[PDB]
């Protein structure tokens with residue numbers, strides 16, 4: 001029931017299913033305690049009092065290790081899975097964790113649940129080029145102006161709708177453990193209520209990797225970073241041209257591009273279906289790609305923009321190499337010297353006789 005087409009076969013927008021993409025994926029952390037085994041300490045406030053409690057981190061005897069998988073795994077609110085770096089780690093040392101998504105994804109949110117008090121200075125970066133460069137996604141720092149040099153909670157008007165602003169809420173110690181930091185990408189952008197026609201916010205959510213630079217916790221002799229469950233929610237960027245993604249031959253995640261579009265993200269038109277410039281599948285117009293018209297006399301075609309504009313943005317469909325002794329934009333008329341045969345249709349393999 002491919003919903004990427006409606007009842008009577010018409011193309012209509014379709015986007016995949018919202019998932020915990022983080023779920024089950026590997027995180028390349030910058031620190032995991034246990035080797036060599038080491039000392040850490042946890043505060044447990046009971047009433048007025050503060051119960052200092054210290055246990056050891058040893059990797060090669062597993063139960064007291066803290067691997068990256070605790071993050072993206074089944075989190076169950078009893079058996080809670082807190083990853084934990086090497087304790088005693090400070091400023092100005094980029095505790096950079098890096099996740100590899102696997103395909104262009106338009107991210108709704110990024111949420112972290114801390115077992116240690118929510119750090120003071122962290123920052124969400126993002127990579128749209130698949131781990132080649134990085135950019136400020138959103139900052140957290142009770143001292144924003146110094147640390148990340150950004151203004152503390154910058155305002156987002158029509159001119160910086162892609163500047164990561166820098167906040168300081170939920171950067172608070174309490175609760176010691178359990179502090180969840182839920183960042184919404186599109187949150188606070190003046191044109192969020194029209195993402196279908198906001199190509200810039202469509203670029204603000206376009207992400208391929210995520211980097212997290214912890215620079216500083218709070219100033220409480222052990223102290224560390226521990227996180228329980230990590231979720232990167234979002235759908236698969238198919239430009240509204242596929243309602244599900246799948247990995248292919250040599251295992252690489254690409255869309256199920258419909259609408260005669262081509263590409264991993266459907267960004268372009270499949271060969272021959274260049275009759276209309278690829279556009280974004282929005283709320284009402286699939287803006288699908290369309291096969292040219294050659295009357296079955298050709299196999300390839302380009303796209304002429306005058307003929308689009310000069311037609312009034314209708315079709316730039318120009319056939320390449322009309323076979324079967326025809327010619328013309330739509331192979332719609334015989335070659336020179338070959339007369340047309342009224343007994344045979346234009347699409348015949350001998351519609352044109354000598």
Ligand SMILES: *[C@@H]1O[C@H](CO)[C@@H](O)[C@H](O)[C@H]1NC(C)=O
Pocket residue numbers: 078079
């Ligand atoms: C966690 O898993 C172990 C499995 O042996 C179980 O004993 C324990 O009760 C579970 N949950 C908690 C809250 O300890």
Ligand SMILES: *[C@@H]1O[C@H](CO)[C@@H](O)[C@H](O)[C@H]1NC(C)=O
Pocket residue numbers: 030094095096
């Ligand atoms: C820390 O930041 C510096 C900035 O020059 C960079 O070169 C380095 O790779 C970063 N290190 C880590 C561990 O992220």
